[model samples]
Target: YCQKWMWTCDSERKCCEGMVCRLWCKKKLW
Candidate 1:
């Protein structure tokens, strides 16, 4: 999860960075 990304999360949904829930994005401030 890196910022908001829509492709299957409905309207692009992301949670923090280090995008383990998406791809790969370093975790940032929540």
Candidate 2:
């Protein structure tokens, strides 16, 4: 998880990289 939300990441933690992290959080899909 990252910054207070349940976040899923890749083996290198690249899934949370760049604007994708914020973009995903904004959606609140989880």
Candidate 3:
């Protein structure tokens, strides 16, 4: 299992080291 904040349905918020992380942090995409 993962932490509450770690639980994200959006692929962008699933992990790091990709454009997903960028979009997630930048608040440009979900």
Model 1 per-residue lDDT tens digits across residues 2-28: 355322232355544334343433344
What local distance difference test score does each model get?
Answer: 0.39, 0.40, 0.33
Q: Which stretches of candidate 2 lie over 4 Å from their true place?
A: 1-4, 14-30
Tens-digit per-residue lDDT, 1-30, candidate 3: 221332233542444323233322232345
- Model 1: pairs clashing at backbone N, Cα or C within 3 Å: 1-19, 5-12, 6-12, 18-25, 18-26, 19-25
Each model's total of backbone clashes: 6, 0, 0
> Which candidate number has the best lDDT?
2
Question: Which candidate tops TM-score?
Answer: 2
CA RMSD (A), model 1: 7.8
Model 2 over residues 1-30: C-alpha lDDT tens digits? 443344555444544323244333233454
In candidate 1 the C-alpha lDDT for residue 9 amounts to: 30
User: In model 1, which runs have C-alpha deviations exceeding 4 angstroms?
Assistant: 1-11, 22-30
Off by over 4 Å in 3: 1-8, 15-30
